[PDB]
Design a protein around this ligand. Structure first.
Ligand SMILES: [Mg+2]
Ligand SMILES: [Mg+2]
Ligand SMILES: [Pb+2]
Ligand SMILES: [Pb+2]
Ligand SMILES: [Zn+2]
Ligand SMILES: [Zn+2]
Lengths: 244, 244
């Protein structure tokens, strides 16, 4: 059954008449399953990961505004958006906070924003060619599913390289940056409750929870459990230590 | 280059030691691309489309409530949800309607709901084993991307069988029932404006537009243009003909 090696051998490296071959078998209608595999294979091969600029691989950029000249640049922007989205969701909550603590909330929410700008909304997480302690991918653009929140790794071994294909760039939209300790369900509200407590809040902790890879797992959609994460915040890290 | 035929030949029909083979090459770490193709192949093969009950293929049902015993049944429910979702979105608009026409809107919105219940929210669209003039798939469960709204067919030839795999069932979540004439952008508001007109509204027309395959294209995420569909409603079908 060692057969396969010879198969993965030819179907991996493109630049051949294989691309112009698989396409023919596709045009020439076939069974649903065979058509699938064939469509997938063409996808797998019709790729150009190495290209970085719109000039050398404009296909990738189809549909993206013009400001986007570089791939890393777009993905960086994309990541910044999800995270900026989390910051918005956090402000929207100021209303469900006690009017008495509503001021401090905004004060705290302001600090988190400065720090976010200070780090450029962590857009660094999606762009290869960034410090290795910042990116979530290999310098080639390969991301690995980190498995569901309640597991150590991805049992299916999901991966994806949004950099070498237009469809690939779009599928990455389905990959989620999932909060281990749910942000809406638990972190934000705990944040509110902590600010009303009276003790000085260690907002940096909530920052970690809300916008950092410390509490974010990058998962493929099949590893995004939409069920409740039965986790809670760390009682001991919520408030700033009183220096006795 | 006719090679491939021999390849798609072995990689399509499972039930062999091939499954227990590809898995080994996966465990035995490899290059990112080879690992990809390999992970995908395992996916492609680890399938059981023919199974219909939770009893004969419980793997598929992982994560679904217990009430769901049958596959078609779940997918039917799933479809009904998207469509019921469109009905909600339509009610939520009653507030942005003139108070004077706000009553009729609810009257009309009521009629559409009766008809929807009368047809079971068209959940029929997703379940194989339904009248051939109702399903969007083959009796085996195969759906074909109908390409973007502004095109006749899917150039990439996207297909998917949510019935033979858990991950497959979840990916179908990314496949969208896209309104050709945008519902929020154009149909709903036209509906509101038409009800304020004074002439008798042919609400059945808007029904078609809002909940039927007459105005819904089933597209893979890569064929869901989120750009504006520069279309408008048919001026001549909005109002009921005055019998002269
Ligand atoms: Mg989540
Ligand atoms: Mg749409
Ligand atoms: Pb701000
Ligand atoms: Pb109703
Ligand atoms: Zn995974
Ligand atoms: Zn398509």
């Amino acid at each position: 059954v060692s057969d396969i090696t010879r198969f993965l051998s030819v179907f991996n490296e493109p630049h051949a008449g294989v691309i112009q071959a698989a396409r023919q078998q596709l045009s020439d209608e076939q069974a649903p399953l065979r058509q699938k595999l064939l469509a997938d294979l063409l996808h797998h091969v019709s790729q150009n990961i190495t290209a970085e600029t719109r000039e050398q691989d404009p296909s990738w950029f189809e549909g993206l505004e013009s400001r986007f000249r570089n791939k890393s640049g777009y993905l960086r922007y994309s990541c910044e958006s999800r995270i900026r989205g989390y910051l918005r969701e956090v402000s929207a909550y100021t209303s469900m906070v006690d009017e008495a603590a509503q001021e401090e909330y905004l004060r705290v929410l302001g600090s988190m924003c400065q720090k976010l700008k200070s780090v450029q909304y962590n857009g660094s997480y999606f762009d290869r060619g960034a410090e290795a302690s910042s990116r979530l991918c290999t310098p080639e653009g390969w991301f690995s599913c980190q498995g569901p929140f309640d597991l150590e790794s991805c049992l299916s071994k999901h991966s994806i390289n949004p950099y070498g294909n237009r469809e690939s760039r779009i599928l990455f939209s389905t990959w989620n940056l999932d909060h281990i300790i749910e942000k809406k369900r638990t972190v934000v509200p705990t944040l509110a409750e902590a600010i009303q407590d009276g003790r000085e809040v260690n907002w940096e902790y909530f920052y970690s929870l809300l916008f950092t890879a410390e509490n974010l797992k990058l998962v493929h959609i099949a590893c995004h459990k939409k069920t409740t994460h039965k986790l809670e915040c760390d009682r001991s890290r919520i408030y700033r230590p009183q220096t006795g």
